Paper text:
The structure was determined by cryo-EM single particle reconstruction, and the cryo-EM map was refined to an overall resolution of 4.4 Å. The TSC complex consists of a central core and two wings (termed wing-a and wing-b) and the overall structure exhibits an elongated arch-shaped fold with approximate dimensions of ~390 × 133 × 88 Å3. TSC1, TSC2, and TBC1D7 assemble the TSC complex with a 2:2:1 stoichiometry, generating an asymmetric modular organization. The two TSC2 molecules form a pseudo-symmetric dimer through tail-to-tail interactions. The coiled-coil domains (CCs, residues 746–971) of TSC1a and TSC1b interwind in parallel and form an extended two-helix bundle with the dimer interface being as much as 2386 Å2. The TSC1 dimer makes multiple contacts with TSC2 dimer and stabilizes the overall conformation of the complex. This parallel dimerization of TSC1 leads to an asymmetric formation of TSC1–TSC2 tetramer and recruitment of a single TBC1D7 molecule, generating a unique and characteristic modular organization. Each TSC2 consists of a HEAT repeat domain (HEAT), a dimerization domain (DD), followed by a C-terminal GAP catalytic domain (GAP). The cHEAT–DD–GAP of the two TSC2 molecules adopt pseudo-symmetric fold, whereas the two wHEAT domains adopt distinct conformations due to differently associated TSC1. The TBC1D7 associates with and stabilizes the C-terminal helices (residues 937–971) of TSC1a/1b but has no direct contact with TSC2. The result is consistent with structural observation and supports the notion that TSC2 uses the asparagine thumb (N1643) to accelerate GTP hydrolysis of Rheb and residues K1638, H1640, and L1641 of the catalytic helix function in supporting the conformation of the asparagine thumb.
Author numbering:
A (entry chain B): 1526 to 1599, 1605 to 1626, 1636 to 1755
B (entry chain B): 614 to 623, 685 to 748, 758 to 937, 1015 to 1079
C (entry chain C), D (entry chain D): 777 to 825
Write the structure that this text describes.
């Protein structure tokens, strides 16, 4: 009993997890549910942004279990490692399922590429709480903004737009995205589901205190 | 007029001097705020400046010109809180924006910190940092020094930590520093770790940024803050509960339950990363496996730490 | 008579437009999978590299 | 009504010509990506070496 507690307790990495999701929209694909997750292809600026997001990643078996279910089967599954935050991207073009994976994540990325506006109503999702809309422009400088689920805008401000050039948009994008993911995990935990606390450290500390309580 | 003329998406640079003039004199009526609201979308569509040969500088100067002075009030709080967004949008052009003028507008933001509010100002500061960090390089120290005096505002609670984090992820910017920078950073962060006052989101984010800066913090002069830190920690648990809130800082040897867990995790992380840095993943060299494969083992819980011991029986040799 | 003339001109414009949009249709349908195959092969080369 | 619809269909054929020439430009960029694909094929042969 305590032995298997040691197995499961050991599992949860001291490296905070971040399942994120990337989308793409086109002119015809604007305000579409069956045309947003259809195309396995985006724009040119979309692709260069994607390859600028993170560094190369492969889903081989020789690498350890540090990858999650998203990106287990089919394809570059771009990611970014750091001191405690692991970031799996779930590129909308790398599922060939995709609806089951992209919808499940709390926060997602949506590249506004058509030229029209955007709302959460594009995809029902699972818990796609907050969105981050990014649109190109004539020159390199391109616009960025974010949208709530009309429920947590008190937690995460929404009237935050900003201009950002090419070599700086991926970083600030992923940054605010991580902030949103933090907000979403804090919200879920605030619903008190007795689930994995976002601070994996305090999580496994609870694990150990639970072992203690189990013995005594 | 302003409404129609600000909608050009195919005759230019005339409207430019028009705007220059109408902002130059202060009409002292709502029309001021009206054109100020006409600005930000014109900055979203500040795209036809491919024609205008960098005369925006003057309006930018004009901007800072009308940033301060009674010649504006000839709504002033709203004046500032709306002109800050327009220069915010303006900051995009790191190139055409004059270098000395960029220094000037950085100083304008520095003075906009001490204000009715600077949330917009501080997030714009994060943006300009990621954009023209060369300019911020000089302002950074005194910037943080003044930031020491925002006094635990739940309003600006989020954007500050956001900015500190973002900055931290930009090492080459702060590639050089000294103790006082980090000390001030931690002093600013610490109060935001209240178990009751701020947000659980704010709490966890604060602990995250504390940890990650303390990581990004130099290996030398790393132990220094450690007591202060836990001081800053124990001074956040001042009156929430005091069962065993004792110092326990290893400088000697070298619900509120959630707050206790917070203190636990933070000081543990520090102990793990004080005196050096090391990834938290062990992977034994093949020799180790060969030696102790299937070895006789035993695991104990001295405290919140999990200790495990394994002993070889020469499996590979007898193999 | 003016009605007749305008109607005839509009019908000819319609024929022109329909044939042009069929041209557009076929070329877009080829372009899509063209670039698909191109990027597929190229990124596979990148992976192998 | 008839003359108005004639003007309508005129602008229709016009934007159709616009999209047609820009579509030819897009197919041009497509064959440019194909040339880059053959560049990646040169990379393929040095890679297999």
């Amino acid at each position: 009993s305590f032995e298997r507690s040691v197995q499961l307790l050991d599992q949860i990495p001291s490296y905070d997890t971040h399942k994120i999701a990337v989308l793409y929209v086109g002119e015809g694909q604007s305000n579409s549910e069956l045309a947003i997750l259809s195309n396995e292809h985006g724009s040119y600026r979309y692709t260069e942004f994607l390859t600028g997001l993170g560094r190369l990643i492969e889903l081989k078996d020789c690498q350890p279990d540090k990858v999650y279910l998203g990106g287990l089967d089919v394809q570059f599954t771009y990611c970014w490692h750091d001191d405690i935050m692991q970031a799996v991207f779930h590129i909308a073009t790398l599922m060939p399922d995709k609806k089951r994976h992209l919808g499940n994540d709390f926060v997602s990325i949506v590249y506004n590429d058509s030229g029209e506006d955007f709302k959460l109503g594009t995809i029902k999702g699972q818990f796609n709480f907050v969105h981050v809309i990014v649109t190109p422009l004539d020159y390199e400088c391109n616009l960025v903004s974010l949208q709530c689920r009309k429920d947590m805008e008190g937690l995460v401000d929404t009237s935050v737009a900003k201009i950002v050039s090419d070599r700086n948009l991926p970083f600030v994008a992923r940054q605010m995205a991580l902030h949103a993911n933090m907000a979403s995990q804090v919200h879920h935990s605030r619903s008190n589901p007795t689930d994995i606390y976002p601070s994996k450290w305090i999580a496994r500390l609870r694990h150990i205190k639970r072992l203690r309580q189990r013995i005594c | 007029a302003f409404d129609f003329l600000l909608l050009l998406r195919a005759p230019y640079s005339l409207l430019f001097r028009v705007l220059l003039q109408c902002l130059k004199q202060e009409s002292d009526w709502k029309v001021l705020k009206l054109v100020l609201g006409r600005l930000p979308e014109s900055l979203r569509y500040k795209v036809l400046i491919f024609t205008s040969p960098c005369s925006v500088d003057q309006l930018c100067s004009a901007l800072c010109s009308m940033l301060s002075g009674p010649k504006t009030l000839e709504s002033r709080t709203d004046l500032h809180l709306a002109v800050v967004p327009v220069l915010t949008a303006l900051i995009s052009y790191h190139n055409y924006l004059d270098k000395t003028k960029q220094r000037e507008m950085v100083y304008c933001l520095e003075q906009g910190l001490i204000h009715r509010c600077a949330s917009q100002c501080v997030v714009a500061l994060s943006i300009c940092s990621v954009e023209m960090p060369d300019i911020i390089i000089k302002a950074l120290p005194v910037l943080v020094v003044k930031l020491t005096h925002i006094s635990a505002t739940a309003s600006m609670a989020v954007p500050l930590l956001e900015f500190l984090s973002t900055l931290a992820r930009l090492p080459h910017l702060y590639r050089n520093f000294a103790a006082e920078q980090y000390a001030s950073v931690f002093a600013i962060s610490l109060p935001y770790t209240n178990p009751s006052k701020f947000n659980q989101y704010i709490v966890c984010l604060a602990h995250h940024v504390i940890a990650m800066w303390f990581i990004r913090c130099r290996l030398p002069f790393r132990k220094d803050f450690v007591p202060f830190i836990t001081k800053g920690l124990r001074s956040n648990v001042l009156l929430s509960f005091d069962d065993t809130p004792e110092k326990d800082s290893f400088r000697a040897r070298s619900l509120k339950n959630l707050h206790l867990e917070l203190t636990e995790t933070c000081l543990d992380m520090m102990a793990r990363y004080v005196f050096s840095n090391f990834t938290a993943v062990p992977k034994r060299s093949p020799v180790g496996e060969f030696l102790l494969a299937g070895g006789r083992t035993k695991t104990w819980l001295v405290g919140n730490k999990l200790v495990t011991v394994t002993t070889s029986v020469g499996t590979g040799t007898r193999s | 008579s003016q009605i007749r003339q305008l109607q005839h001109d509009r019908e000819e414009f319609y024929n022109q437009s329909q044939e042009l949009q069929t041209k557009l249709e076929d070329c877009r349908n080829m372009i899509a999978e063209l670039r698909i195959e191109l990027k597929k092969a190229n990124n596979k080369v990148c992976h192998t590299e």
